[PDB]
Amino acid sequence: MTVKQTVEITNKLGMHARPAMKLFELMQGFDAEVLLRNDEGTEAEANSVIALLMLDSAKGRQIEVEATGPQEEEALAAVIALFNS
């Protein structure tokens, strides 16, 4: 099944915009689809630049990162690790 995890954005989705950019590279290195979602219910598809811009406004908001695939855990863990600094 799919694997997601709620992560609170403390006015910093992580190390600058590297996380978002790195995600694109991770999706290629890992086998699984990663998707981001804001508490507002806005699906910030990690495969869309427009979505990344919307997440930027999520400074202090909660989001729900979802990952599907064999390595879905790695992708999600990698993103969570980056968001946690």
Give all domains of the chain, ordered by start, each with its CATH number. 1-85 (3.30.1340.10)
- DSSP-assigned letter for residue 40: T
Query: Are 38 and 44 contacting, i.e. CB atoms less than 8 angstroms apart?
Result: yes
Rounded distance, CA 21 to CA 15, Å?
A: 11
Catalytic site positions = 16
Q: What are the structure tokens assigned to 84, written together?
A: 């946690």
Q: In what order do the strands lie in the sheet with 33-37?
A: 3-8, 62-68, 33-37, 43-45
3-state DSSP assignment of residue 11:
coil
Q: Tokens 């992708």 belong to which residue?
A: 75
Experimental method: NMR
The angle at the Cα of 64, spanning 58 to 70, to the nearest 5 degrees, equals: 135
Q: Which residues of 75-84 are buried (b: 16+ CB within 10 A; e: fewer)?
A: bbebbbebbe
Query: Are 54 and 48 contacting, i.e. CB atoms less than 8 angstroms apart?
Result: no
3-state DSSP assignment of residue 75:
helix
The angle at the Cα of 21, spanning 61 to 44, to the nearest 5 degrees, equals: 40
